Design a protein around this ligand. Structure first.
Ligand code: CLA
Ligand code: CLA
Ligand code: CLA
Ligand code: CLA
Ligand code: CLA
Ligand code: CLA
Ligand code: CLA
Ligand code: CLA
Ligand SMILES: CC1=C(/C=C/C(C)=C/C=C/C(C)=C/C=C/C=C(C)/C=C/C=C(C)/C=C/C2=C(C)CCCC2(C)C)C(C)(C)CCC1
Ligand SMILES: CC1=C(\C=C/C(C)=C/C=C/C(C)=C/C=C/C=C(C)/C=C/C=C(C)/C=C/C2=C(C)CCCC2(C)C)C(C)(C)CCC1
Ligand SMILES: CC1=C(C/C=C(\C)CCC[C@H](C)CCC[C@H](C)CCCC(C)C)C(=O)c2ccccc2C1=O
Lengths: 64, 80, 730, 163, 106, 141
């Protein structure tokens, strides 16, 4: 396994993101060398209406 | 004469390409994503600045940005 | 045509013409720019604004001396009206020239409102010859500055960049010479010339060397008996022109006003600008410049860092930030100048510095509104030019941990705690006015919530006002603060403040209470709009990178729910509406409170200013009677020019609503239709534009509509202010 | 007295304003008959007006030269000169009510967010829960200082920032 | 009603009565038809509530229970025939009956 | 495509009476656009400028003054009638340029021949501040 576990909650660390210092469920993780593999899903929508986004390994950290 | 730059976070949705009326954007292969696709902006001389491309990108923050700049006849949408 | 920008010149539309003017004096964004060429082009341009100032002053002197009645005004200053400039309008009729020739002059004229007559008369000007000689002097000084802006741009005489970034030498020369020596010389003028001209003696270039200011001369100055110059002050029964009731003093500390001319004593103002010269020369010798002694600016900022870490690194890294950022230096200057401009307004009406200004009711008003409206415009620029610093000239890595980054870190707290104060004052102030509007309306004027401003009345009692009866230290004879300054300033000061026929510390009631709080609503919420546009200039959650786009851009599109009016330019744009509203309340409150004083019926303001129908009935509707009848169907008075202007502002104000409400997309489709007609018409099609016609841009319309808005906001009130006060003459 | 204000009992303009406001009704009362309902309505308004003026005088209010009562805000002068009920005491009567509304809404928000679908609980309220909290908030200042001294009032840098 | 202030609005209208002055022209309408007493106005009000509930009842009936088809709506030529003759024609004829038989003599 | 199709400037046009949204003096002087497609039957379609027109069985040709007017029609034909249009750009000098299916495949489908342009290898944000580029143009490039 390369990254966090399925169904595990993680905290985001992108300064650009609407979900920054916020928590979301890990939907999936790809192990094929992609730059932004970690797929995360949040309950709260962003300004557009999207509730998912692919984040990186360094950009996510353990909850709270 | 507008500027269109696409960033590393593209995932090959093609929704930016479908939305642009003026055919500024096209898809090119790439090894960074699952879909193995990436956008491109070869012909920005025909860009107009509608920002429908930015509206369709589903990322957390946009993989496509239209940085407005100097104007022209094609950019101002002048039939005359 | 723009040579400084090739990107706009290639534009075929009319957007080239408009944007070429607005980006003209924005040297940073120009093509082929350099930091060294930037400072030089500024240094040359700043010579230009001086050239227009000294010429603008020369025009007033000439147009007054040639066409005015300065010689006739000095003899009877109270009754005679001043004259600004004559009139030549061939579209007049015979009734108008007969009405506009109210002055003693032959032809029609315009009555002045600035107050230059009271100013020139005070400093010792008593003839039209002396104004002709002066108008030539400034026109020469004006030409000299134009020659310098060209000279100091040449290949030689071209200052280097290190010369501009020498702060320690600029402070010492400007604090000591520009401020101090200039203030020292002005005292030299008041002593050698003006005070004699008050006491009858004619002093001029012919006889200033032979005439002594004091009988003893300078021998007291060297001996140390400096109190000899304050021995025989001018008596109360003293005419300002003649030697009846005169004295020999040149420096005195009498305090208070002169009885006949309700104005400050000249001997005091002479003594004033002397002490200011001493402190400012002393402060000029502070910083270090080419000698061993002196302070350094960078060493000070690095030192004032608190040990515990309440401010982190503290003021470190700020010297290179200020010295290299021109927008930072401009924000502090405007914020300082814009505040001073309000002091000039607040401290002149209460302390008249000129002769026969308290009697000229129309002149006091315009001088107050003129400076305060300028104080708002200037102060809105400090934040705006302060916001541009965060985009262009801010480096986070250099300014890390310092006060400037620690402010920007927690900006969500500042903008939030501000919003509480605006909401708090807004609900509770309006709720009381509306509570009083209603309860007046049901016939019960006793149920109003009238709260007395006790804290302000506590001050006036602590500053000599014995009406309220608090019996504070300086209203009490036993206290030391009364004992100290008893021989110096208090007999003249206590007489004036306790007199209820001057504007010095007017009586306060519950009507004055609500307005000072309503004024607080303006400043705290106007600051909110401008502070937000500054701190959120670099980025927002809706637009994480505003810094890449610029200070002024229309929007980021309809996506993300809509992004209209996000840029920092659009924050400044919205604040000007609040700047004008705030200054309007401040200025409405000055005019009405003074009209009731001048009309003698102070009870009008105290009882009617507690509910808002009083403002609409007793101030606006009532005082707009003589004005509105400027041109009646029966005839026309001299106030016709003001009623015409009064509508002219009610119209310009409305035309801006077009550019504000109706936006571009409706119009560009319309211009496309006129273009079709111009080509399909048989003969007009032979003519063809050189530049393609297009509608005005988005940002341009916000600017244009704000100009049509603000100009009507000003031209409307200026007519009402002058016409209401001039027609009643009180 | 204080601030050069006379009490409302001793003022002349205060009684002048009473004689005026009653004269309007007496003139209006002349039109109608004695036993009619318009007569009874105006007589009641006359009775209320006479009661409004005497009660404000009895309460040690301060009337100015205009003849209208003025309020004092500093608790020092209010307590010294017996004018506390005007401003100083109602300040605490409000804040008790205002904090009641915050302590209640804050608790409904926290508790609904501990369950599934909190969005539905806002548009479709749990009225049994809302009434329970609304009758449990009589002692909200105790819970606040309990929650402050404990540290479970404020969140700690788990909030979104923008840069 | 007599609570805080708010009774001064009941102005001295005249007629042993005080209240708000209306500007809707109902009094002149009720006089153009024969209406001399208040009892006629009460009955007219009770009729409206009765007819209004029927109109509300019909909206439920003609949607929730027995709703027409698209064919019934597209019969456009029958609407004009019924809505001209029946509604505007007989409705004006009926009012003349009220005018002729009641309003004129009163 | 296999090869760029050259322009046939003499093909039948649809049956359209005319309108006022046509071409202006800009077309003869600067440039104009023309679109081609091939229909299997006679149908009716909405024009971008004006009203309705009747296509013709076989090749069809229009002339427009804007690229958006042409691509607006492609989106209608590709969706409603499921056709494959192709449009050019004609200058005043007579030069002709083949624009939209420049590779033969529409842009929303990948192809191996294409090469990326204006591709930054970084995340949005994560770029230098304007102060670093204060005296020349560009923070994004
Ligand atoms: C008795 C011990 C004592 C005390 C009380 C102080 C007190 C102070 N020192 Mg100090 N100092 C001490 C001993 C002490 N010092 C010693 C022994 C040394 C070694 C020599 C120093 C060396 C030292 C240095 C070198 C410096 C200080 C400074 C300061 C000042 C600011 C420090 C700070 O954290 O800002 C307080 C922290 C804040 C974060 C500010 C909060 C701002 C509020 C929240 C804003 C509210 C605004 C809002 C609009 C309010 C409403 C207003 C409305 C009514 C109009 C403060 C007055 C600094 C100074 O001179 O600056 C003045 C400084 O640079 N100290
Ligand atoms: C008379 C016109 C008017 C009024 C009343 C306001 C009021 C306000 N503006 Mg505003 N504004 C106006 C014109 C006006 N503006 C114009 C022309 C412009 C230029 C575009 C702006 C630009 C502007 C900006 C840029 C900003 C504001 C802000 C504010 C708020 C300041 C905080 C405050 O004091 O709120 C309290 C004051 C009030 C008067 C509250 C209004 C509500 C009262 C109590 C009535 C309550 C309703 C009542 C119960 C009946 C409702 C029934 C009905 C629903 C059926 C406030 C809501 C600032 C803001 O929102 O920051 C917080 C802000 O940033 N305005
Ligand atoms: C109590 C009887 C009853 C019941 C249980 C229902 C139940 C239903 N109806 Mg039905 N209906 C009824 C009576 C009833 N209807 C009547 C009497 C009529 C004739 C008007 C209709 C006409 C009707 C239509 C035409 C439709 C329904 C629909 C529906 C369904 C959706 C209900 C909904 O959205 O709630 C809405 C809940 C409300 C409380 C609505 C209140 C609206 C009132 C009238 C407005 C009041 C005006 C206000 C006082 C003015 C002041 C405002 C100011 C700003 C001016 C549901 C099966 C819809 C359907 O089939 O579902 C798709 C549909 O399209 N009904
Ligand atoms: C010491 C004073 C001072 C100085 C040296 C500068 C210098 C500068 N400012 Mg600044 N500014 C100031 C005060 C100052 N400002 C004040 C007080 C304000 C607040 C109002 C502003 C608000 C401000 C903004 C909002 C912006 C600048 C900008 C600029 C830059 C130049 C833009 C340019 O060329 O515009 C040239 C513009 C024009 C020639 C158009 C002005 C036309 C005016 C509005 C019309 C006036 C009405 C009309 C004539 C009335 C006639 C009456 C009629 C009845 C006859 C430059 C760095 C711009 C900048 O840096 O961009 C990044 C910018 O966006 N300034
Ligand atoms: C910026 C300074 C300034 C300003 C605003 C004016 C303004 C004016 N001058 Mg003036 N003037 C000035 C400086 C100025 N003067 C100086 C320095 C001189 C000395 C050469 C003159 C000499 C002068 C003459 C000789 C005349 C004017 C006239 C006028 C008026 C003509 C209308 C016009 O377009 O202008 C106008 C009120 C003309 C007029 O009729 O005034 C009523 C006229 O005959 N001016
Ligand atoms: C003694 C030497 C000396 C003097 C007199 C000056 C004087 C000046 N320098 Mg300067 N300078 C000096 C040495 C000196 N410099 C040195 C050594 C350097 C190199 C380090 C510079 C570098 C330098 C630069 C780079 C610039 C200047 C500029 C200026 C001008 C400022 C603009 C202005 O008019 O403000 C006038 C200000 C006053 C007269 C006094 C202060 C005003 C405040 C508000 C007080 C108000 C008092 C009172 C209430 C007013 C009442 C008015 C009455 C009529 C009612 C001014 C003429 C600027 C310039 O070139 O402008 C063209 C500029 O950009 N200086
Ligand atoms: C910013 C709020 C504020 C302001 C401006 C005032 C202002 C005043 N208070 Mg006051 N006060 C306040 C809040 C405030 N109070 C609060 C919150 C309390 C606690 C309930 C008091 C309790 C209080 C007492 C007990 C007394 C005053 C007194 C006074 C007056 C004399 C100066 C003074 O305080 O002593 C100087 C203070 C130096 C720090 C002055 C009008 C005195 C008075 O009655 O004046 C005649 C007095 O005896 N005050
Ligand atoms: C009970 C819920 C609640 C609570 C505890 C708070 C708490 C706060 N708000 Mg907030 N607010 C709320 C709801 C709430 N808000 C709602 C619904 C709105 C939209 C109208 C706002 C809009 C708002 C603004 C615009 C601002 C605040 C601000 C603030 C802070 C200062 C207090 C203030 O200015 O009050 C202001 C209060 C109002 C303007 C109106 C509040 C609406 C009612 C009175 C309360 C809501 C009750 C709720 C519906 C009941 C649910 C009960 C449940 C059992 C069913 C404080 C942290 C200020 C801030 O930025 O912090 C410094 C500020 O400027 N509030
Ligand atoms: C945003 C920004 C900016 C801006 C700023 C501003 C604009 C500011 C404002 C502010 C202000 C504009 C301030 C003001 C101040 C003032 C004050 C603070 C004063 C006070 C005073 C006092 C202290 C006094 C005292 C006294 C005496 C002395 C005597 C008598 C009594 C008394 C007590 C009164 C800048 C550029 C920096 C940049 C960055 C960003
Ligand atoms: C006011 C009101 C009301 C009431 C009333 C009503 C409205 C009534 C009704 C009405 C009626 C009461 C009606 C009736 C009518 C009738 C008719 C319309 C009849 C006529 C007839 C005809 C049509 C003709 C006949 C004939 C002849 C002549 C010849 C031969 C035979 C025949 C048959 C053909 C209500 C409550 C409801 C509502 C509200 C208001
Ligand atoms: C009317 C209108 C137009 C069209 C207005 C036009 C084209 C008028 C400008 C051209 C006329 C000919 C200039 C009129 C001359 C001025 C009275 C004086 C100008 C002085 C300057 C030269 C200094 C817009 O383009 C627009 C754009 C965005 C929002 C609102 C609007 C809007 O309201």
């Amino acid at each position: 396994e390369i990254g966090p576990k399925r169904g595990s909650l993680v905290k985001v660390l992108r300064p650009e993101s609407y979900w920054y210092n916020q928590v979301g469920k890990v939907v999936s993780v790809d192990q094929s060398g992609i730059r932004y593999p970690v797929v995360v899903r949040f309950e709260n929508q962003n300004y557009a209406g999207v509730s998912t986004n692919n984040y990186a390994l360094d950009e996510i950290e353990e909850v709270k | 004469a507008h500027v269109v730059k696409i960033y590393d976070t593209c995932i090959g949705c093609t929704q930016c390409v479908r939305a642009c009326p003026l055919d500024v954007l096209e898809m090119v292969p790439w090894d960074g994503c699952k879909a193995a696709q990436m956008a491109s902006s070869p012909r920005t001389e025909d860009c107009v600045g509608c920002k429908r491309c930015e509206t369709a990108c589903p990322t957390d923050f946009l993989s496509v940005r239209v940085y407005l700049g100097n104007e022209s006849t094609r950019s101002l949408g002048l039939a005359y | 045509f723009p040579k400084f920008s090739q990107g706009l010149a290639q534009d075929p539309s009319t957007r080239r013409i408009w944007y070429g003017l607005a980006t003209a004096h924005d040297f940073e964004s120009h093509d082929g720019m350099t930091e060294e060429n930037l400072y030089q082009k500024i240094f040359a341009s700043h010579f230009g604004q001086l050239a227009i100032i000294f010429l603008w002053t020369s025009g007033n002197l000439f147009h007054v001396a040639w066409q005015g009645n300065f010689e006739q005004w000095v003899t009877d200053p109270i009754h005679v009206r001043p004259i600004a400039h004559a009139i030549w309008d061939p579209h007049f009729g015979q009734p108008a020239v007969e009405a506009f020739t109210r002055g003693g002059a032959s032809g029609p004229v315009n009555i002045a409102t600035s107050g230059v007559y009271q100013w020139w008369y005070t400093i010792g000007l008593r003839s039209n010859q002396e104004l002709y000689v002066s108008s030539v002097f400034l026109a020469l000084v004006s030409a000299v500055f134009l020659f310098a802006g060209w000279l100091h741009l040449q290949p030689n005489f071209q200052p280097s960049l290190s010369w501009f970034k020498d702060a320690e030498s600029r402070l010492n020369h400007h604090l000591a010479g520009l401020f101090g020596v200039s203030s020292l010389a002005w005292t030299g003028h008041l002593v050698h010339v003006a005070i004699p001209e008050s006491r009858g003696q004619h002093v001029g270039w012919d006889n200033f060397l032979s005439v002594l200011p004091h009988p003893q001369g300078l021998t007291p100055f060297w001996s140390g008996n400096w109190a000899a110059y304050a021995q025989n002050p001018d008596t109360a029964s003293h005419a300002f022109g003649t030697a009846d009731g005169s004295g020999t003093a040149i420096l005195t500390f009498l305090g208070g006003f002169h009885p006949q001319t309700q104005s400050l004593w000249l001997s005091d103002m002479a003594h004033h600008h002397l002490a200011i010269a001493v402190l400012f020369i002393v402060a000029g010798h502070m910083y270090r410049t080419n000698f061993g002694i002196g302070h350094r600016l960078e060493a000070i900022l690095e030192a004032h860092t608190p040990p515990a870490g309440g401010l982190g690194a503290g003021h470190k890294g700020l010297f290179h930030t200020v010295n290299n950022s021109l927008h930072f230096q401009l924000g502090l200057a405007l914020a300082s100048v814009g505040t001073i401009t309000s002091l000039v307004a607040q401290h002149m009406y209460s302390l008249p510095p000129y002769a026969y200004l308290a009697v000229d009711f129309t002149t006091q008003a315009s001088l107050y509104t003129h400076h305060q409206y300028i104080a708002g415009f200037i102060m809105c620029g400090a934040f705006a030019h302060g916001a541009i610093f965060f985009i262009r000239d801010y480096d986070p890595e250099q300014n890390k941990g310092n006060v400037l980054a620690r402010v920007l870190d927690h900006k969500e707290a500042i903008i939030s705690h501000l919003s509480w104060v605006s909401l708090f004052l807004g609900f509770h102030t309006l709720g009381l006015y509306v509570h009083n509007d209603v309860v007046q309306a049901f016939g019960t004027p006793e149920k109003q919530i009238l709260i007395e401003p006790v804290f302000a009345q506590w001050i006036q009692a602590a500053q000599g006002k014995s009406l309220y009866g608090f019996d504070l230290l300086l209203a009490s004879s036993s206290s030391p603060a009364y004992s100290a300054g008893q021989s110096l300033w208090l007999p003249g000061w206590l007489e004036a403040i306790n007199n209820n026929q001057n504007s010095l510390f007017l009586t306060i009631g519950p009507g004055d209470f609500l307005v000072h709080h309503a004024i607080a609503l303006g400043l705290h919420t106007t600051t909110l709009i401008l502070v937000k546009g500054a701190l959120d200039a670099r980025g927002s959650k809706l637009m994480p990178d505003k810094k890449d786009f610029g200070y002024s851009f229309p929007c980021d599109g309809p996506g993300r729910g809509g992004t209209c009016d996000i840029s920092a330019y659009d924050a400044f744009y919205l604040a000007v509406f609040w700047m004008l509203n705030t200054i309007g309340w401040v200025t409405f409150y000055w005019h009405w409170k003074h009209l009731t004083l001048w009309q003698g019926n102070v009870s009008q303001f105290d009882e009617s200013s507690t509910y808002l129908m009083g403002w609409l009935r007793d101030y606006l509707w009532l005082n707009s009677s003589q004005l509105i009848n400027g041109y009646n169907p029966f005839g026309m008075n001299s106030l016709s020019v003001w009623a015409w202007t009064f509508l002219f502002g009610h119209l310009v104000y409305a035309t801006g609503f077009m550019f504000l409400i109706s936006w571009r997309g409706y119009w560009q489709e319309l211009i496309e239709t006129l273009v079709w007609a111009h080509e399909k018409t048989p003969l007009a099609n032979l003519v063809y534009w050189k530049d393609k016609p297009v509608a005005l841009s988005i940002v341009q319309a916000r600017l244009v509509g704000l100009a049509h808005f603000s100009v009507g906001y000003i031209f409307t009130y200026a007519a009402f202010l002058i016409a209401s006060t001039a027609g009643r003459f009180g | 007295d204080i601030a050069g204000l006379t009490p409302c009992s001793e003022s002349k303009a205060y009684n002048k304003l009473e004689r005026k406001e009653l004269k309007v009704l007496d003139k209006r009362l002349k039109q109608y008959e004695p036993g009619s309902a318009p007569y009874l309505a105006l007589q009641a308004t006359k009775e209320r007006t006479e009661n409004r003026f005497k009660t404000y005088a009895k309460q040690g209010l301060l009337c100015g030269n205009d003849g209208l009562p003025h309020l004092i805000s500093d608790p020092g002068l209010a307590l010294r000169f017996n004018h506390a009920g005007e401003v100083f005491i109602p300040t605490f009567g409000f804040l008790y009510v205002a904090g009641y509304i915050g302590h209640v809404g804050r608790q409904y928000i926290i508790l609904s967010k501990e369950d599934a679908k909190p969005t539905d609980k806002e548009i479709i309220l749990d009225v049994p829960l809302a009434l329970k909290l609304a009758f449990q908030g009589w002692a909200w200042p105790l819970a606040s200082i309990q929650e402050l001294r404990n540290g479970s009032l404020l969140e700690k840098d788990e909030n979104i920032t923008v840069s | 009603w007599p609570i805080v202030g708010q009774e001064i609005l009941n102005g001295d209208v005249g007629g042993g009565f005080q209240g708000i002055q209306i500007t809707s022209g109902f009094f002149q309408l009720w006089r153009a038809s024969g209406i001399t007493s208040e009892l006629q106005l009460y009955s007219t009000a009770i009729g409206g509530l009765v007819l209004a509930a029927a109109c509300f009842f019909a909206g439920w009936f003609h949607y929730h229970k027995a709703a027409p088809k698209l064919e019934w709506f597209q019969n456009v030529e029958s609407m004009l025939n019924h809505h001209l003759a029946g509604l505007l024609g007989l409705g004006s004829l009926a009012w003349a009956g009220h005018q002729i038989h009641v309003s004129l003599p009163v | 495509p296999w090869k760029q199709p050259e322009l046939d400037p003499d093909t039948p046009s649809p049956i359209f009476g005319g309108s006022t949204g046509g071409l202006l003096r800009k077309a003869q002087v600067e440039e104009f656009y023309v679109i081609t497609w091939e229909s299997p039957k006679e149908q009716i379609f909405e024009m971008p400028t004006g009203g309705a027109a009747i296509m013709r069985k076989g090749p069809n040709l229009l002339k427009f003054a804007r690229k958006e007017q042409c691509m607006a029609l492609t989106t209608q034909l590709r969706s409603k009638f499921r056709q494959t249009p192709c449009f050019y750009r004609v200058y005043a000098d007579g030069k002709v340029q083949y624009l939209h299916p420049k590779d033969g495949v529409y842009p929303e489908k990948v192809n191996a021949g294409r090469v990326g342009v204006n591709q930054n290898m970084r995340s949005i944000g994560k770029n230098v501040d304007p102060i670093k580029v204060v005296k020349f143009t560009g923070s994004e490039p």
